[PDB]
Amino acid sequence: IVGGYTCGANTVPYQVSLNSGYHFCGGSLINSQWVVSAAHCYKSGIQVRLGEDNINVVEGNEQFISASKSIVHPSYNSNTLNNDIMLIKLKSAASLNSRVASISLPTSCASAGTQCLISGWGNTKSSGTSYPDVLKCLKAPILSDSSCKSAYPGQITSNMFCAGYLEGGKDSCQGDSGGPVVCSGKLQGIVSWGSGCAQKNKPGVYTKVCNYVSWIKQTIASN
């Protein structure tokens, strides 16, 4: 996250870190046994890490649970990033508490102008690289479909939305991928892509979770 603030330990209780020897992506806990992330985060050997503050320190509220399976969306296209969503199942259910908690799926798609919370452990620099180790947060509005398409000609599908600031300076970044965009207490987006980070006229692009609620529910019900 570039231009954000330190969230505070365990203040984003649905935020998970995906670890394969190291943190490589975020995710969102949507029930005691399932995480939503980005399809472009898929790999072998995933451990889901819940209750994290500093991802380099065991502070006392963590739960580390290996994945039993993951399910990339059937229509994910890695060239266009259309349908950039996957589900990850935990081998055992997490123990839910005030610091490890699920986030609800949306009932309705959120509108341009709605304020959301974007969070992650990704790079905090638009030029160069620095990883923060503690969770960073950014409050940002959803942008109009028109603004989003104008920023990225030929690239925005009906399964994507932009959020952030056209002026620059405040955005998600590398290492935030797969993490949450929460608006009014519901998971509306997944950190997906953008050109650089926090560049003028290049806002963040997010997977539009409301389009996937039926797929998520039906997949969980049978897996």
Q: Which residues bind ligand D86 (CB under 6 A)?
A: 171-174, 176-177, 191, 193-194, 197, 204
Given the residues 84, 102, 176, 192, the one annotated as active site = 84
Question: C-alpha 152: how far from its chain's center?
Answer: 20
CB nearer to ligand D86: pick between 13 and 178: 178
Please state the closest distance from residue 59 (CB atom) to ligand D86, in A. Answer: 26
Helices (H), the chain: 145-151, 213-221
Please state the closest distance from residue 58 (CB atom) to ligand D86, in A. Answer: 27
CB nearer to ligand D86: pick between 106 and 189: 189
CB nearer to ligand D86: pick between 51 and 180: 180
Instruction: Identify whether the C-beta of residue 218 lies closer than 8 Å to the C-beta of residue 64.
Output: no
Catalytic annotation present for 40? yes
Please state the closest distance from residue 213 (CB atom) to ligand D86, in A. Answer: 22
Tally Cβ neighbours within 10 Å of residue 135: 25
Catalytic annotation present for 177? yes
Residue 114: closest CA among 137, 142, 138: 142
Given the residues 28, 37, 40, 192, the one annotated as active site = 40
Question: In Å, what is the CA distance from 136 to each residue of 55, 75, 106, 145?
Answer: 12, 31, 23, 26
CB nearer to ligand D86: pick between 173 and 182: 173
Tell me the binding residues for substrate: 171-172, 174-175, 177
Please state the closest distance from residue 208 (CB atom) to ligand D86, in A. Answer: 15
**Angstrom distance (rounded) from CA 32 to CA 184:** 21
Nearest position to ligand D86, beta carbon: 194
Question: In Å, what is the CA distance from 162 to each residue of 113, 140, 159?
Answer: 11, 10, 11
For 63-113, give the DSSP string. EEEEEEEEEE-TT--TTT-TT--EEEEESS----BTTB---BPPSSPPPTT
Tell me the binding residues: 52, 54, 57, 62, 171-172, 174-175, 177
Tell me the binding residues for Ca(2+): 52, 54, 57, 62
Taking the CA atoms of the chain, what radius of gyration do you get in angstroms? 16
Q: Which residues are catalytic?
A: 40, 84, 177
